Amino acid sequence: GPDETLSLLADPYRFISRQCQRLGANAFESRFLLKKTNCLKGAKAAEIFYDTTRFEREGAMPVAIQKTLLGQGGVQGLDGETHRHRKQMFMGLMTPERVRALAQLFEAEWRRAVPGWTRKGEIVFYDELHEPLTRAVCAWAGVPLPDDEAGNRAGELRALFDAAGSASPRHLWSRLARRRVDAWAKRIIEGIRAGSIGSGSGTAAYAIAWHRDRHDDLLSPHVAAVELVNVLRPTVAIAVYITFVAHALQTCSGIRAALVQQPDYAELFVQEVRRFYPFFPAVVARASQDFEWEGMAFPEGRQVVLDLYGSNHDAATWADPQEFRPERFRAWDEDSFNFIPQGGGDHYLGHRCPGEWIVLAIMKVAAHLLVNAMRYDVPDQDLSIDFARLPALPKSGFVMRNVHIGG
Ligand code: HEM
Ligand SMILES: CCCCCCCCCCCCCCCC(=O)O
């Protein structure tokens, strides 16, 4: 077969589901670079993808991703009891009280940032979200962050996810940002261990700095740094979902009124933003043993990718996936495989995102502020979603004018 890397990079969110549509199947064999790859979509495929007796992650992460988005030595590259033990470290951070604490810090940072937006007269909403998120998450995680460094650190965290997938010098910026953020986070871990930094016992940086592995050993400082960045970075990446919240409010008739007056609506709305909008395209794993599934061969070692966007738009599951309809979540049964914007399966026993509770809480803050507190004008602009960009965004970044919060 031919190499389809270029076709995938040209349409990273939709390539798999479009090919599935042409072939009338939920899976097809392709090739990306040197690797034959089985591409999978839909709930049944997701359930097999999360079977850890058939799939492993070790060695599946490309070097370019290790050098930008994820770092080296983090939980994403682990399998088995080594994985489960490291994953418990992240899961223990996510109590309802701690998630609420982060949401509260974020609301405060957003409110603190508004006067600056008012003074600018016109803002790119996406561009303005990274710093308040950075300030909130650093405070919550026990990471000291001087006021005069917050903007710089927010730009570095942003570069890890926003510039990683850019076929331009921006990718070089992402690589430098990774070197810088790893060094910074390592100084934080070192300071906590030496007693020069007094992060609290319930904070992420404390938990990670003092985590003991399965041999009762502390994580090496670099690995601890990477795991701390695995909390900070994706929290800043919620900027993308917050921008999509503003986009849905602007482009979908009836949503604003429903959010303002119906109190149970916000939970449905945020879930539908996660279902509808492209963000995390797909996940990669490797077959751990020979098997066949639905007439397709999965030889030991076969690279496999699971299409999250395509799964979230599977008409068999959703019936009318092309519409933005928060109401659809009234009928959801909380299946762990059929709605997978941040992965599928079980949080403890697999690689599913431990950040979902944070994401939902922060999205609800955003929805509340954009309809109940923050007044703004939206000038004529190109709001269409850029499906060629990683992460996807409205092409304009969502431009606002005359922003204020006294109204
Ligand atoms: C901003 C939107 C986010 C999206 C779209 C997202 C999506 C994902 C996805 C698709 C995965 C991989 C699932 C897999 O490998 O099977 C993942 C893993 C992960 N996410 Fe998120 N996530 C987000 C936010 C967060 C937040 C706020 C945190 C804060 C702790 C977080 C921490 C992690 C970690 C540590 C993993 C690796 C878990 C593991 O490998 O066991 N994420 N996320
Ligand atoms: C030069 C080729 C590399 C391509 C890199 C593609 C990476 C896709 C990342 C886009 C989604 C970003 C979501 C945030 C992820 C997180 O913070 O863990």
Side-chain angles (χ1 to χ4, degrees), residues 49-50 57 75-77 83 87 90 93-94 227 230-239 241 279-280 282-283 308 340-344 347 350-356 358-359:
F49 188 83
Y50 285 99
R57 306 305 183 85
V75 66
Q76 295 90 346
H83 172 258
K87 181 53 166 291
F90 287 95
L93 308 173
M94 307 308 180
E227 296 293 45
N230 279 331
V231 176
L232 305 178
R233 178 197 72 251
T235 304
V236 174
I238 302 165
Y241 271 145
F279 193 168
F280 212 104
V283 180
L308 307 180
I340 58 177
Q342 303 180 228
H347 290 92
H351 286 269
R352 187 176 183 130
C353 179
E356 295 189 281
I358 289 168
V359 171

mmCIF file of all heavy atoms in Angstrom, residues 49-50 57 75-77 83 87 90 93-94 227 230-239 241 279-280 282-283 308 340-344 347 350-356 358-359, ligand 1:
data_model
loop_
_atom_site.group_PDB
_atom_site.id
_atom_site.type_symbol
_atom_site.label_atom_id
_atom_site.label_comp_id
_atom_site.label_asym_id
_atom_site.label_seq_id
_atom_site.Cartn_x
_atom_site.Cartn_y
_atom_site.Cartn_z
ATOM 1 N N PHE A 49 -9.720 -1.350 21.326
ATOM 2 C CA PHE A 49 -8.508 -0.506 21.457
ATOM 3 C C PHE A 49 -8.065 -0.361 22.911
ATOM 4 O O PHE A 49 -6.862 -0.296 23.204
ATOM 5 C CB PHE A 49 -8.784 0.865 20.839
ATOM 6 C CG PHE A 49 -7.568 1.750 20.743
ATOM 7 C CD1 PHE A 49 -6.676 1.628 19.664
ATOM 8 C CD2 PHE A 49 -7.336 2.732 21.713
ATOM 9 C CE1 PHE A 49 -5.551 2.470 19.555
ATOM 10 C CE2 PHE A 49 -6.218 3.584 21.615
ATOM 11 C CZ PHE A 49 -5.317 3.449 20.530
ATOM 12 N N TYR A 50 -9.045 -0.325 23.819
ATOM 13 C CA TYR A 50 -8.784 -0.221 25.257
ATOM 14 C C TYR A 50 -8.622 -1.563 25.964
ATOM 15 O O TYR A 50 -8.441 -1.620 27.189
ATOM 16 C CB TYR A 50 -9.850 0.669 25.927
ATOM 17 C CG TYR A 50 -9.578 2.126 25.595
ATOM 18 C CD1 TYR A 50 -10.284 2.775 24.587
ATOM 19 C CD2 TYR A 50 -8.549 2.825 26.245
ATOM 20 C CE1 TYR A 50 -10.025 4.095 24.249
ATOM 21 C CE2 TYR A 50 -8.279 4.153 25.914
ATOM 22 C CZ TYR A 50 -9.000 4.777 24.920
ATOM 23 O OH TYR A 50 -8.731 6.091 24.617
ATOM 24 N N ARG A 57 1.051 0.664 24.728
ATOM 25 C CA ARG A 57 1.479 1.982 24.303
ATOM 26 C C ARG A 57 2.980 2.108 24.229
ATOM 27 O O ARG A 57 3.468 3.045 23.583
ATOM 28 C CB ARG A 57 0.939 3.086 25.227
ATOM 29 C CG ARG A 57 -0.588 3.034 25.397
ATOM 30 C CD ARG A 57 -1.360 3.066 24.066
ATOM 31 N NE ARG A 57 -2.809 3.093 24.325
ATOM 32 C CZ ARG A 57 -3.519 4.202 24.563
ATOM 33 N NH1 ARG A 57 -2.933 5.394 24.572
ATOM 34 N NH2 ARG A 57 -4.827 4.108 24.815
ATOM 35 N N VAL A 75 3.395 9.256 31.711
ATOM 36 C CA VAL A 75 2.419 8.183 31.884
ATOM 37 C C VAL A 75 1.885 7.629 30.546
ATOM 38 O O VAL A 75 1.555 6.437 30.449
ATOM 39 C CB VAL A 75 1.263 8.678 32.810
ATOM 40 C CG1 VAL A 75 0.446 9.821 32.152
ATOM 41 C CG2 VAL A 75 0.356 7.534 33.157
ATOM 42 N N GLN A 76 1.815 8.482 29.519
ATOM 43 C CA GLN A 76 1.273 8.056 28.195
ATOM 44 C C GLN A 76 2.053 6.896 27.584
ATOM 45 O O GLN A 76 1.487 6.121 26.799
ATOM 46 C CB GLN A 76 1.260 9.230 27.209
ATOM 47 C CG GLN A 76 0.333 10.357 27.593
ATOM 48 C CD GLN A 76 0.970 11.430 28.454
ATOM 49 O OE1 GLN A 76 2.061 11.261 29.009
ATOM 50 N NE2 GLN A 76 0.263 12.560 28.577
ATOM 51 N N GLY A 77 3.341 6.770 27.934
ATOM 52 C CA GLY A 77 4.169 5.735 27.317
ATOM 53 C C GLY A 77 4.278 4.452 28.121
ATOM 54 O O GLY A 77 5.054 3.555 27.762
ATOM 55 N N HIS A 83 2.092 1.350 34.473
ATOM 56 C CA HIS A 83 1.121 2.381 34.084
ATOM 57 C C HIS A 83 0.083 2.628 35.162
ATOM 58 O O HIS A 83 -0.193 3.771 35.522
ATOM 59 C CB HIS A 83 0.393 2.024 32.780
ATOM 60 C CG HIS A 83 -0.725 2.963 32.499
ATOM 61 N ND1 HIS A 83 -2.049 2.641 32.735
ATOM 62 C CD2 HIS A 83 -0.705 4.255 32.081
ATOM 63 C CE1 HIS A 83 -2.794 3.710 32.473
ATOM 64 N NE2 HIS A 83 -2.006 4.687 32.044
ATOM 65 N N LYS A 87 -0.693 6.113 36.917
ATOM 66 C CA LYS A 87 -1.985 6.747 36.612
ATOM 67 C C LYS A 87 -2.747 7.095 37.912
ATOM 68 O O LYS A 87 -3.405 8.127 37.981
ATOM 69 C CB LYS A 87 -2.823 5.810 35.716
ATOM 70 C CG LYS A 87 -4.186 6.343 35.296
ATOM 71 C CD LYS A 87 -4.084 7.753 34.645
ATOM 72 C CE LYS A 87 -5.410 8.121 33.928
ATOM 73 N NZ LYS A 87 -5.599 7.257 32.700
ATOM 74 N N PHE A 90 -2.115 10.594 39.134
ATOM 75 C CA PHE A 90 -2.937 11.653 38.547
ATOM 76 C C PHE A 90 -4.371 11.604 39.050
ATOM 77 O O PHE A 90 -4.991 12.637 39.336
ATOM 78 C CB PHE A 90 -2.964 11.544 37.018
ATOM 79 C CG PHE A 90 -1.663 11.964 36.362
ATOM 80 C CD1 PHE A 90 -0.704 11.006 36.042
ATOM 81 C CD2 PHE A 90 -1.416 13.306 36.073
ATOM 82 C CE1 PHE A 90 0.534 11.383 35.430
ATOM 83 C CE2 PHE A 90 -0.208 13.699 35.489
ATOM 84 C CZ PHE A 90 0.769 12.723 35.144
ATOM 85 N N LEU A 93 -5.430 13.322 42.301
ATOM 86 C CA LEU A 93 -5.552 14.786 42.301
ATOM 87 C C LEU A 93 -6.981 15.275 42.072
ATOM 88 O O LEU A 93 -7.278 16.438 42.352
ATOM 89 C CB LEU A 93 -4.685 15.394 41.194
ATOM 90 C CG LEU A 93 -3.220 14.961 41.154
ATOM 91 C CD1 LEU A 93 -2.540 15.520 39.901
ATOM 92 C CD2 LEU A 93 -2.531 15.431 42.447
ATOM 93 N N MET A 94 -7.856 14.394 41.574
ATOM 94 C CA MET A 94 -9.110 14.840 40.958
ATOM 95 C C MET A 94 -10.352 14.727 41.847
ATOM 96 O O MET A 94 -11.442 14.413 41.359
ATOM 97 C CB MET A 94 -9.355 14.073 39.651
ATOM 98 C CG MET A 94 -8.183 14.122 38.682
ATOM 99 S SD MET A 94 -7.647 15.829 38.408
ATOM 100 C CE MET A 94 -6.310 15.473 37.261
ATOM 101 N N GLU A 227 5.766 14.827 34.233
ATOM 102 C CA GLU A 227 4.420 14.538 34.760
ATOM 103 C C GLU A 227 3.730 15.798 35.285
ATOM 104 O O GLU A 227 2.526 15.967 35.098
ATOM 105 C CB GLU A 227 4.498 13.454 35.844
ATOM 106 C CG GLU A 227 5.005 12.077 35.301
ATOM 107 C CD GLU A 227 4.054 11.365 34.320
ATOM 108 O OE1 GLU A 227 3.485 11.959 33.397
ATOM 109 O OE2 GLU A 227 3.896 10.150 34.473
ATOM 110 N N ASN A 230 2.439 17.484 32.414
ATOM 111 C CA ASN A 230 1.222 16.763 32.000
ATOM 112 C C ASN A 230 -0.053 17.174 32.767
ATOM 113 O O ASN A 230 -1.139 16.737 32.385
ATOM 114 C CB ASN A 230 1.419 15.239 32.108
ATOM 115 C CG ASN A 230 2.176 14.651 30.911
ATOM 116 O OD1 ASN A 230 2.112 15.166 29.792
ATOM 117 N ND2 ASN A 230 2.891 13.561 31.150
ATOM 118 N N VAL A 231 0.086 17.988 33.822
ATOM 119 C CA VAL A 231 -1.044 18.661 34.467
ATOM 120 C C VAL A 231 -1.168 20.100 33.948
ATOM 121 O O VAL A 231 -2.248 20.547 33.547
ATOM 122 C CB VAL A 231 -0.866 18.666 35.995
ATOM 123 C CG1 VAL A 231 -2.002 19.463 36.685
ATOM 124 C CG2 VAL A 231 -0.838 17.204 36.516
ATOM 125 N N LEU A 232 -0.056 20.829 33.964
ATOM 126 C CA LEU A 232 -0.103 22.233 33.576
ATOM 127 C C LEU A 232 -0.525 22.462 32.117
ATOM 128 O O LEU A 232 -1.421 23.266 31.839
ATOM 129 C CB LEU A 232 1.253 22.915 33.831
ATOM 130 C CG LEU A 232 1.799 22.797 35.263
ATOM 131 C CD1 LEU A 232 3.170 23.492 35.317
ATOM 132 C CD2 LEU A 232 0.828 23.375 36.342
ATOM 133 N N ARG A 233 0.135 21.769 31.190
ATOM 134 C CA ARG A 233 -0.080 21.973 29.764
ATOM 135 C C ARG A 233 -1.532 21.723 29.313
ATOM 136 O O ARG A 233 -2.138 22.589 28.674
ATOM 137 C CB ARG A 233 0.887 21.097 28.962
ATOM 138 C CG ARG A 233 0.704 21.208 27.436
ATOM 139 C CD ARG A 233 1.377 20.042 26.749
ATOM 140 N NE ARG A 233 0.628 18.788 26.974
ATOM 141 C CZ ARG A 233 1.028 17.780 27.753
ATOM 142 N NH1 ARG A 233 2.154 17.885 28.483
ATOM 143 N NH2 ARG A 233 0.272 16.681 27.814
ATOM 144 N N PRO A 234 -2.095 20.546 29.621
ATOM 145 C CA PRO A 234 -3.441 20.325 29.080
ATOM 146 C C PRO A 234 -4.490 21.218 29.752
ATOM 147 O O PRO A 234 -5.541 21.486 29.164
ATOM 148 C CB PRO A 234 -3.709 18.845 29.358
ATOM 149 C CG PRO A 234 -2.680 18.426 30.325
ATOM 150 C CD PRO A 234 -1.539 19.365 30.311
ATOM 151 N N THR A 235 -4.220 21.689 30.968
ATOM 152 C CA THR A 235 -5.147 22.660 31.578
ATOM 153 C C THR A 235 -5.155 23.968 30.769
ATOM 154 O O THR A 235 -6.226 24.558 30.503
ATOM 155 C CB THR A 235 -4.848 22.894 33.058
ATOM 156 O OG1 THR A 235 -4.870 21.636 33.757
ATOM 157 C CG2 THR A 235 -5.922 23.818 33.692
ATOM 158 N N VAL A 236 -3.975 24.395 30.328
ATOM 159 C CA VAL A 236 -3.896 25.570 29.462
ATOM 160 C C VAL A 236 -4.584 25.291 28.128
ATOM 161 O O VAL A 236 -5.204 26.185 27.540
ATOM 162 C CB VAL A 236 -2.432 26.026 29.300
ATOM 163 C CG1 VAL A 236 -2.339 27.187 28.259
ATOM 164 C CG2 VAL A 236 -1.874 26.464 30.661
ATOM 165 N N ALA A 237 -4.533 24.038 27.668
ATOM 166 C CA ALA A 237 -5.177 23.676 26.397
ATOM 167 C C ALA A 237 -6.701 23.784 26.440
ATOM 168 O O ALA A 237 -7.351 23.777 25.378
ATOM 169 C CB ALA A 237 -4.718 22.257 25.927
ATOM 170 N N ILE A 238 -7.264 23.945 27.642
ATOM 171 C CA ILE A 238 -8.727 24.155 27.737
ATOM 172 C C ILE A 238 -9.134 25.471 27.032
ATOM 173 O O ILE A 238 -10.294 25.624 26.629
ATOM 174 C CB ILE A 238 -9.245 24.069 29.203
ATOM 175 C CG1 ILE A 238 -8.880 22.694 29.821
ATOM 176 C CG2 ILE A 238 -10.788 24.279 29.286
ATOM 177 C CD1 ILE A 238 -9.032 22.654 31.343
ATOM 178 N N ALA A 239 -8.185 26.383 26.838
ATOM 179 C CA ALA A 239 -8.395 27.541 25.963
ATOM 180 C C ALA A 239 -9.110 27.196 24.650
ATOM 181 O O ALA A 239 -9.983 27.953 24.185
ATOM 182 C CB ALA A 239 -7.043 28.226 25.679
ATOM 183 N N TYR A 241 -11.240 24.564 24.069
ATOM 184 C CA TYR A 241 -12.648 24.284 24.326
ATOM 185 C C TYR A 241 -13.430 25.528 24.721
ATOM 186 O O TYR A 241 -14.619 25.655 24.381
ATOM 187 C CB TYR A 241 -12.786 23.237 25.427
ATOM 188 C CG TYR A 241 -12.806 21.801 24.969
ATOM 189 C CD1 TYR A 241 -12.216 20.807 25.758
ATOM 190 C CD2 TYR A 241 -13.494 21.414 23.805
ATOM 191 C CE1 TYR A 241 -12.263 19.435 25.383
ATOM 192 C CE2 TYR A 241 -13.545 20.063 23.400
ATOM 193 C CZ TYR A 241 -12.928 19.078 24.199
ATOM 194 O OH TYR A 241 -12.982 17.759 23.816
ATOM 195 N N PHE A 279 -10.873 18.226 18.438
ATOM 196 C CA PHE A 279 -9.794 18.705 19.310
ATOM 197 C C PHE A 279 -8.648 17.690 19.318
ATOM 198 O O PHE A 279 -7.615 17.917 18.700
ATOM 199 C CB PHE A 279 -10.341 19.015 20.711
ATOM 200 C CG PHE A 279 -9.397 19.810 21.614
ATOM 201 C CD1 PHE A 279 -9.884 20.353 22.795
ATOM 202 C CD2 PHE A 279 -8.046 19.973 21.320
ATOM 203 C CE1 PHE A 279 -9.063 21.060 23.686
ATOM 204 C CE2 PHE A 279 -7.207 20.698 22.185
ATOM 205 C CZ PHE A 279 -7.707 21.237 23.377
ATOM 206 N N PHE A 280 -8.823 16.589 20.041
ATOM 207 C CA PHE A 280 -7.814 15.531 20.071
ATOM 208 C C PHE A 280 -8.235 14.602 18.945
ATOM 209 O O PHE A 280 -9.255 13.926 19.059
ATOM 210 C CB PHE A 280 -7.890 14.794 21.412
ATOM 211 C CG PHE A 280 -6.569 14.259 21.909
ATOM 212 C CD1 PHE A 280 -5.881 14.913 22.940
ATOM 213 C CD2 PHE A 280 -6.031 13.094 21.379
ATOM 214 C CE1 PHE A 280 -4.676 14.411 23.432
ATOM 215 C CE2 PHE A 280 -4.811 12.591 21.868
ATOM 216 C CZ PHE A 280 -4.151 13.245 22.891
ATOM 217 N N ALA A 282 -7.117 11.748 17.405
ATOM 218 C CA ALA A 282 -6.948 10.304 17.449
ATOM 219 C C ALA A 282 -5.827 9.851 18.419
ATOM 220 O O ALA A 282 -4.961 10.645 18.842
ATOM 221 C CB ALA A 282 -6.681 9.777 16.027
ATOM 222 N N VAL A 283 -5.848 8.562 18.759
ATOM 223 C CA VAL A 283 -4.882 7.962 19.703
ATOM 224 C C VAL A 283 -4.126 6.808 19.026
ATOM 225 O O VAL A 283 -4.682 6.131 18.145
ATOM 226 C CB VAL A 283 -5.622 7.442 20.958
ATOM 227 C CG1 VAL A 283 -4.670 6.805 21.968
ATOM 228 C CG2 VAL A 283 -6.436 8.566 21.598
ATOM 229 N N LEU A 308 -10.915 9.531 17.381
ATOM 230 C CA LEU A 308 -11.868 10.037 18.394
ATOM 231 C C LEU A 308 -12.958 10.900 17.753
ATOM 232 O O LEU A 308 -14.149 10.733 18.051
ATOM 233 C CB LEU A 308 -11.131 10.839 19.480
ATOM 234 C CG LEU A 308 -9.960 10.095 20.149
ATOM 235 C CD1 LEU A 308 -9.321 11.017 21.199
ATOM 236 C CD2 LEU A 308 -10.401 8.759 20.785
ATOM 237 N N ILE A 340 -15.989 9.745 23.256
ATOM 238 C CA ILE A 340 -14.583 9.602 23.652
ATOM 239 C C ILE A 340 -13.684 10.805 23.254
ATOM 240 O O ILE A 340 -12.535 10.618 22.784
ATOM 241 C CB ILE A 340 -13.993 8.260 23.109
ATOM 242 C CG1 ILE A 340 -14.110 8.173 21.564
ATOM 243 C CG2 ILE A 340 -14.688 7.051 23.790
ATOM 244 C CD1 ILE A 340 -13.487 6.931 20.956
ATOM 245 N N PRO A 341 -14.161 12.042 23.496
ATOM 246 C CA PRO A 341 -13.343 13.218 23.143
ATOM 247 C C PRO A 341 -11.992 13.265 23.889
ATOM 248 O O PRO A 341 -11.037 13.879 23.394
ATOM 249 C CB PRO A 341 -14.225 14.406 23.577
ATOM 250 C CG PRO A 341 -15.068 13.838 24.715
ATOM 251 C CD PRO A 341 -15.377 12.424 24.253
ATOM 252 N N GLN A 342 -11.937 12.653 25.064
ATOM 253 C CA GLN A 342 -10.693 12.580 25.848
ATOM 254 C C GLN A 342 -10.392 11.118 26.157
ATOM 255 O O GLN A 342 -9.878 10.779 27.224
ATOM 256 C CB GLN A 342 -10.816 13.464 27.121
ATOM 257 C CG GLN A 342 -11.147 14.932 26.732
ATOM 258 C CD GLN A 342 -11.284 15.899 27.893
ATOM 259 O OE1 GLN A 342 -12.250 16.670 27.950
ATOM 260 N NE2 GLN A 342 -10.334 15.873 28.831
ATOM 261 N N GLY A 343 -10.686 10.253 25.187
ATOM 262 C CA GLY A 343 -10.405 8.828 25.337
ATOM 263 C C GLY A 343 -11.589 8.029 25.864
ATOM 264 O O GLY A 343 -12.598 8.578 26.313
ATOM 265 N N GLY A 344 -11.431 6.715 25.828
ATOM 266 C CA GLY A 344 -12.487 5.787 26.239
ATOM 267 C C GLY A 344 -12.013 4.842 27.322
ATOM 268 O O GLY A 344 -10.862 4.912 27.794
ATOM 269 N N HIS A 347 -10.662 4.946 33.613
ATOM 270 C CA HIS A 347 -9.566 5.894 33.952
ATOM 271 C C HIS A 347 -8.408 5.237 34.682
ATOM 272 O O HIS A 347 -7.255 5.635 34.494
ATOM 273 C CB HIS A 347 -10.091 7.048 34.815
ATOM 274 C CG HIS A 347 -10.990 7.992 34.088
ATOM 275 N ND1 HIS A 347 -12.368 7.858 34.061
ATOM 276 C CD2 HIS A 347 -10.700 9.092 33.351
ATOM 277 C CE1 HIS A 347 -12.881 8.833 33.331
ATOM 278 N NE2 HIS A 347 -11.890 9.597 32.895
ATOM 279 N N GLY A 350 -6.803 2.101 32.234
ATOM 280 C CA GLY A 350 -6.380 2.405 30.881
ATOM 281 C C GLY A 350 -5.908 3.837 30.789
ATOM 282 O O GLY A 350 -5.793 4.518 31.807
ATOM 283 N N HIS A 351 -5.674 4.293 29.561
ATOM 284 C CA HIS A 351 -5.060 5.608 29.347
ATOM 285 C C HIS A 351 -6.049 6.777 29.228
ATOM 286 O O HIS A 351 -5.656 7.890 28.890
ATOM 287 C CB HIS A 351 -4.163 5.537 28.108
ATOM 288 C CG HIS A 351 -2.899 4.786 28.360
ATOM 289 N ND1 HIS A 351 -1.733 5.413 28.784
ATOM 290 C CD2 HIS A 351 -2.620 3.464 28.294
ATOM 291 C CE1 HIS A 351 -0.791 4.496 28.952
ATOM 292 N NE2 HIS A 351 -1.301 3.311 28.655
ATOM 293 N N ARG A 352 -7.330 6.532 29.518
ATOM 294 C CA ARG A 352 -8.323 7.604 29.434
ATOM 295 C C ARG A 352 -7.898 8.846 30.210
ATOM 296 O O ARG A 352 -7.346 8.757 31.307
ATOM 297 C CB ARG A 352 -9.682 7.091 29.977
ATOM 298 C CG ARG A 352 -10.822 8.094 29.755
ATOM 299 C CD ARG A 352 -12.163 7.467 30.231
ATOM 300 N NE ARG A 352 -13.232 8.416 29.953
ATOM 301 C CZ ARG A 352 -14.359 8.113 29.314
ATOM 302 N NH1 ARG A 352 -14.630 6.837 28.957
ATOM 303 N NH2 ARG A 352 -15.229 9.094 29.056
ATOM 304 N N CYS A 353 -8.196 10.010 29.648
ATOM 305 C CA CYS A 353 -7.769 11.297 30.234
ATOM 306 C C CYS A 353 -8.279 11.475 31.678
ATOM 307 O O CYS A 353 -9.491 11.437 31.917
ATOM 308 C CB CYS A 353 -8.340 12.418 29.364
ATOM 309 S SG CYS A 353 -7.901 14.040 29.998
ATOM 310 N N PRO A 354 -7.371 11.696 32.639
ATOM 311 C CA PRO A 354 -7.778 11.982 34.013
ATOM 312 C C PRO A 354 -8.251 13.428 34.186
ATOM 313 O O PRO A 354 -8.753 13.776 35.264
ATOM 314 C CB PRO A 354 -6.486 11.746 34.810
ATOM 315 C CG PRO A 354 -5.375 12.149 33.830
ATOM 316 C CD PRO A 354 -5.903 11.684 32.469
ATOM 317 N N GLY A 355 -8.071 14.257 33.152
ATOM 318 C CA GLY A 355 -8.436 15.653 33.228
ATOM 319 C C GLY A 355 -9.881 15.970 32.890
ATOM 320 O O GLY A 355 -10.252 17.140 32.868
ATOM 321 N N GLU A 356 -10.713 14.948 32.665
ATOM 322 C CA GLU A 356 -12.090 15.241 32.193
ATOM 323 C C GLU A 356 -12.875 16.069 33.196
ATOM 324 O O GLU A 356 -13.631 16.967 32.785
ATOM 325 C CB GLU A 356 -12.860 13.955 31.856
ATOM 326 C CG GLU A 356 -12.239 13.202 30.684
ATOM 327 C CD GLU A 356 -13.131 12.064 30.242
ATOM 328 O OE1 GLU A 356 -13.113 11.027 30.912
ATOM 329 O OE2 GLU A 356 -13.851 12.234 29.247
ATOM 330 N N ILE A 358 -11.756 18.273 35.446
ATOM 331 C CA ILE A 358 -11.266 19.648 35.299
ATOM 332 C C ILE A 358 -11.826 20.323 34.048
ATOM 333 O O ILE A 358 -12.305 21.467 34.106
ATOM 334 C CB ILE A 358 -9.731 19.671 35.264
ATOM 335 C CG1 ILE A 358 -9.205 19.350 36.680
ATOM 336 C CG2 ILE A 358 -9.221 21.043 34.773
ATOM 337 C CD1 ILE A 358 -7.685 19.040 36.741
ATOM 338 N N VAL A 359 -11.742 19.629 32.911
ATOM 339 C CA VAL A 359 -12.229 20.202 31.660
ATOM 340 C C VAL A 359 -13.706 20.580 31.793
ATOM 341 O O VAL A 359 -14.102 21.692 31.445
ATOM 342 C CB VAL A 359 -12.021 19.252 30.453
ATOM 343 C CG1 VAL A 359 -12.763 19.797 29.196
ATOM 344 C CG2 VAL A 359 -10.522 19.165 30.128
HETATM 345 C C1 HEM B 1 -8.009 20.438 27.197
HETATM 346 C C2 HEM B 1 -8.682 19.380 26.716
HETATM 347 C C3 HEM B 1 -8.195 17.936 26.842
HETATM 348 C C4 HEM B 1 -8.322 17.002 25.883
HETATM 349 C C5 HEM B 1 -8.966 17.159 24.486
HETATM 350 C C6 HEM B 1 -7.713 15.808 26.377
HETATM 351 C C7 HEM B 1 -7.679 14.603 25.715
HETATM 352 C C8 HEM B 1 -6.945 13.517 26.134
HETATM 353 C C9 HEM B 1 -6.817 12.278 25.402
HETATM 354 C C10 HEM B 1 -7.500 11.960 24.062
HETATM 355 C C11 HEM B 1 -5.973 11.480 26.086
HETATM 356 C C12 HEM B 1 -5.430 10.113 25.668
HETATM 357 C C13 HEM B 1 -6.341 8.908 25.856
HETATM 358 C C14 HEM B 1 -5.586 7.644 25.495
HETATM 359 O O1 HEM B 1 -4.325 7.645 25.377
HETATM 360 O O2 HEM B 1 -6.272 6.598 25.356
HETATM 361 C C15 HEM B 1 -5.568 12.185 27.279
HETATM 362 C C16 HEM B 1 -4.694 11.684 28.229
HETATM 363 C C17 HEM B 1 -4.246 12.402 29.315
HETATM 364 N N1 HEM B 1 -4.718 13.642 29.748
HETATM 365 FE FE1 HEM B 1 -6.061 14.787 28.754
HETATM 366 N N2 HEM B 1 -7.227 16.024 27.662
HETATM 367 C C18 HEM B 1 -7.513 17.330 27.984
HETATM 368 C C19 HEM B 1 -7.296 17.920 29.203
HETATM 369 C C20 HEM B 1 -6.565 17.424 30.252
HETATM 370 C C21 HEM B 1 -6.331 18.040 31.536
HETATM 371 C C22 HEM B 1 -6.989 19.354 31.980
HETATM 372 C C23 HEM B 1 -5.468 17.279 32.235
HETATM 373 C C24 HEM B 1 -4.966 17.596 33.676
HETATM 374 C C25 HEM B 1 -4.485 16.664 34.494
HETATM 375 C C26 HEM B 1 -5.135 16.151 31.377
HETATM 376 C C27 HEM B 1 -4.232 15.143 31.636
HETATM 377 C C28 HEM B 1 -4.013 14.022 30.892
HETATM 378 C C29 HEM B 1 -3.030 12.996 31.226
HETATM 379 C C30 HEM B 1 -2.024 12.969 32.392
HETATM 380 C C31 HEM B 1 -3.202 11.935 30.197
HETATM 381 C C32 HEM B 1 -2.430 10.609 30.078
HETATM 382 C C33 HEM B 1 -3.265 9.534 30.838
HETATM 383 C C34 HEM B 1 -2.692 8.145 30.617
HETATM 384 O O3 HEM B 1 -1.887 7.965 29.653
HETATM 385 O O4 HEM B 1 -3.023 7.204 31.391
HETATM 386 N N3 HEM B 1 -5.855 16.270 30.203
HETATM 387 N N4 HEM B 1 -6.183 13.445 27.296
#
